[model samples]
Target chain A: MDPEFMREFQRAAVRLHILHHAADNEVHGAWLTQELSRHGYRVSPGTLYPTLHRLEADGLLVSEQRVVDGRARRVYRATPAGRAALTEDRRALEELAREVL
Target chain B: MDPEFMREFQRAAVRLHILHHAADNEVHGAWLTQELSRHGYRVSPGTLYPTLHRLEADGLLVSEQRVVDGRARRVYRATPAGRAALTEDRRALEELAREVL
Candidate 1:
């Protein structure tokens, strides 16, 4: 397979996952990494944090600092636009999978 | 939504569809465009042709010119490597969807 192409495919998968979870509730980078790994996505903190930052930068997500055990932790959740994008992506993924997979 | 990210997602969808059909039988660009349209993927020849060319260059597909109705037409089929990749992609997509979608 094309390596570059596969990278994009996997990236989209991660983005969709992040948006889905964030839409439900606030999520942090470390938690996302662990959760994604359970789903067969081996995302490291290095990659996961950057991806979270990018999502926030792209306006798909919003992040805030929260006190967890006396330590400041960054948590993220999907924005209204992000939720809409998730809906669109879900439909697209389902249609694509139904036809291609 | 990020335009660049979305482009990649749609491109992967098209690639998967192409590989799936090519693995089953030879397919041409025009037919792929129409067939993908039915699946909610609107692929144009401008995009589809280049994508097919790229897949061939990446060794996932092979094409031959055949005389159909007295006209030379190019039809593409998946290589053994392409078939293997298709299996891998299917598993990945399914696992990812189960977790993320």
Candidate 2:
């Protein structure tokens, strides 16, 4: 695959996984942070939170504030638009990679 | 492809491309920033220059001070080890993506 393309490609993968993993449910910020880190992302709180805000602000995610285990937290779920973007970008990346091969 | 794998997968691609582009030649920071951006990266100076320093500090890239077009600038080239890492990672990313399909 083209190296330049791979950056966007990997980012798309991470986003898709998050969406898929949270399909039909909401995911918490802590959950996403832990999950991405376990998968080898050296994500900082600065980077991760901004990215989540971007996704939510862009309407790709819907956010809700709730109390979980007596603590207040924000939960995120993929919106219809987010799932659409995920599906579209996922296919595009695959097709592009295939062509590169 | 597994979504979790895609993020790392993409990062590998970008790293390999930059290394490949600089093979047998020195590159400037500005050049890499432009090249990656043209390829769809939303890279920042903060993200990029640090990455370059890391690659150099890690021995994947060698750095030098030079005057380019009357401007003092830092130039970088892939070290032997850097080339080895690039090639190895490039191939590994390809294999992983292939398997994901």
Candidate 3:
């Protein structure tokens, strides 16, 4: 099996899930990794952070630093563009799922 | 909008659909293109066939030449590995859809 080929879809799906979570509420790197693991994607921060950074660079997400428990956390939330991209992704994915699954 | 970014998922979805179809029955170039269009993917033979060829190269598919009406047709069918891969994909995709959609 082409595991790399199989992984390509999972990575893209993770991006959608990231956007979906951010559109609903703020997410930090740890929470995002946990959320993805719940959905069977155990992405390491080493890899997942870059995905977040890519979404940020793509102008779909914005982040701010917050301090809690005397610790600093960088939290990410969807920009309007991220919300829009999530909506589009959801629609397209639903149609494909209907046929493929 | 990052149309190219969006398209990455669609193209991979196309690969899934192709495997899904071939697992059930033999698929040919023209039929595959038309079938994908019906499912909201209007991939040209130029792009779609290479995907088919890629799958062939990846040991997921096998092809044979058939002649009908005095025309030679290249037909593709899923190998055992392809069927196994599709099963894995379906299970993975179903889990993702339940969450993301």
Candidate 4:
């Protein structure tokens, strides 16, 4: 059951998860799609794709093109600014959970 | 440290909180402003005012104009649909916290 608010909540959550994973290490889109699912999200191409570019556009992540065997891969890693933002945002999220839940 | 994501996250949070408290009982605008602040949000007129209207428009909450001791008050309570949405949204939020924090 997807309420509009719930969908918005998931969108907000996926944004954080993306930055969290990207800060942990360079990440691939497909891998992140699975990781989001691993984190109990119903991720779609529509959600994941633009989120990646938006993160980069916001300067929270930077992407690099790589060659895995022979196929080209685009990978993302958090920027210093992104890492800084993540630290505060993670703490904020933690405090929010602490207070609300 | 308000990253764009964090701002969006807080917006999502305040929506849940408003529904949650409204579901608990009828809630007033001023009371919710303080309640949100108590919940670690920097609730402002800009955020809270429009949000109330939006929630009602979304059918999560319905408002009633009241005369409380000669003062006019606009109060809100969660609709049945709101309670259902809150259940799913709260579960999703709890799961996100369980995984992330």
Candidate achieving the largest TM-score: 3
DockQ of the two-chain complex in candidate 4? 0.43
Identify the runs in model 1 with alpha carbons over 4 angstroms from their true place.
A1-5, A67-69, B1-5, B68-70
Q: How much of the true contact map at the interface does candidate 3 reproduce, as a fraction?
A: 0.43
Q: Give per-model TM-scores.
A: 0.78, 0.50, 0.81, 0.76
Top model number, lDDT = 3
Expressed as tens digits, the lDDT of each residue in B1-101 for candidate 3 is 65645668777788889988999999888898898888878898789878888899888989999898999988999999999888777666566666775
Off by over 4 Å in 4: A37-47, A68-70, A80-84, B38-40
Q: Per-residue lDDT of B3-95 in model 4, one digit per residue for the tens?
A: 676767777788878888999999999999998888678888887989889889888889999999999999999999888876777676566
Question: Model 1, B1-101: lDDT tens per residue?
Answer: 55645776677788888999999999978889898898777787889999899899989999999999989999999999898777777666666566654
Ranking by DockQ: 3, 1, 4, 2
TM-score of chain A taken by itself, candidate 1: 0.85
Q: Pick the candidate with the highest DockQ.
A: 3
Cα RMSD, model 2: 8.0
Compose the digit string of candidate 1's lDDT tens values, residues A37-75.
776678887788788888888899999998989899989
Better of 2 and 3 by DockQ: 3
In candidate 1, how many Å is residue A39 off? 3.4
Question: What C-alpha lDDT do the candidate models reach, one value each?
Answer: 0.81, 0.64, 0.82, 0.81
What is the lDDT for B96 in model 2? 37
Lowest summed lDDT window (length 10), candidate 4 chain B:
B92-101
